[PDB]
Structure formats: C-alpha cells, structure tokens
C-alpha cells in the first residue's frame, strides 16, 4: 500500500523553488520538514518569521507542516503550513495518488476552496539514494515545533 511518510519533490511556483521535503507521523498526525532545494543551494535563515525570536533558525531540518490527520485511505486534512518565502501560514489538505504522488492543496481558508493545488512527486528509494539526500534525525526535527 501507499503511505504519506516519504520524500517528495515540490512544485516550483513563482519565487518558491522546487524543494525536497520529508513527511513523517508522530502521535498519529503527519508533519513535514525541508531537506534541500532541488538545485543544491545552501539553507538560509527564516528572516520573514513574524516572530523575531525565530528569525535565526534554518529553513532546512525544520517543521513547516503540522497537524495533518488521515481521514480516508488516501486522504488528509487539518494541516497548517508555514511558508519561509513570505512568513505566512496556510491551511493544508492532501490527497495521495496510487503511485504515491500528492495533490497538495494550499489555502487561506480552512476548507481549501480559496487556495491552490500543486503536485508533489514521490521519490523512490533509488532516487533518494542517488540525489544523496540527507534524512535528518526526527527527534531533533520534532524539538523544532516551537
């Protein structure tokens, strides 16, 4: 079967670059953190965080998506995504395809209607291996929620 935990490649949109991200579960809900940008570039600081005491943390290895609940066999809701490129938090829902890819809906908008849907490709273990992607340890990544 397909599951959400995994590594995906996000969709380029405006000044927001394609990036590799990892989804994981904890206490029954799903979360995600950023690994690196597709073009290999260096991790930068969270300069636009509304909270001044957070502007020092990296945009990589840090949880930007939290609180996603599985509601159907391939269906998730209730999530909230922080966006490093603008400092805003968006409501997120996700539908997963049978090949594992995500239709990732980002909105304003608890119900998802005043938002946009992107497609995030699932990576196989072979691609993850060949891109030399770093999988961060998850206890440390968890401390990153506040």
CATH of the domain at 33: 2.40.128.520
Kindly list the distances between the CA atom of residue 100 and the CA atoms of 13, 45, 122, 137, 146, in Å, as whole numbers in the listed order.
21, 31, 6, 23, 30
Query: How many degrees, rounded to 5, is the angle at CA 52 between CA 48 and CA 58?
Result: 60
Other Cβ atoms closer than 10 A to 72: 9
What's the rounded Cα separation, in Å, for the pair 25 and 32? 9
What's the rounded Cα separation, in Å, for the pair 30 and 7? 13
Q: What Rg value do the Cα atoms of the chain yield, rounded?
A: 14
What is the widest separation between alpha-carbon atoms in the chain? 43
Query: How many degrees, rounded to 5, is the angle at CA 53 between CA 108 and CA 22?
Result: 55
Least Cα distance to 26 among 91, 60, 83, 70 occurs for 70
Other Cβ atoms closer than 10 A to 90: 18
Range of the domain at 54: 1-146
What's the rounded Cα separation, in Å, for the pair 34 and 64? 8
Query: How many degrees, rounded to 5, is the angle at CA 101 between CA 95 and CA 104?
Result: 45
Q: Could you tell me where the DSSP H helices lie in the chain?
A: 125-130, 138-142
Least Cα distance to 11 among 33, 40, 45, 37 occurs for 37
The count of domains in the chain is 1
Give counts: helices (H), strands (E), the chain.
2, 8
What's the rounded Cα separation, in Å, for the pair 100 and 124? 10
């Amino acid at each position: 079967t397909v599951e959400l935990p995994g590594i995906y490649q996000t969709q380029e949109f405006l000044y927001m670059k394609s990036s590799f991200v990892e989804f994981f579960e904890h206490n029954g809900k799903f979360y995600a953190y950023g690994i690196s940008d597709v073009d290999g570039s260096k991790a930068k600081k969270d300069k636009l965080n509304p909270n001044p005491k957070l502007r020092n943390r990296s945009d990589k290895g840090v949880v930007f998506l939290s609180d996603l609940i599985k509601v159907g066999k391939r269906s998730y809701k209730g999530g909230k995504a922080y966006n490093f490129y603008d400092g805003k938090t968006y409501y997120v829902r996700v539908a997963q395809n049978s090949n594992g890819d995500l239709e990732f809906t980002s909105s304003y908008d608890k119900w998802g209607y005043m938002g946009k849907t992107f497609t995030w490709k699932r990576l196989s273990d072979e691609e993850i291996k060949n891109l030399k992607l770093k999988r961060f340890n998850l206890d440390e990544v968890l401390k990153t929620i506040k």
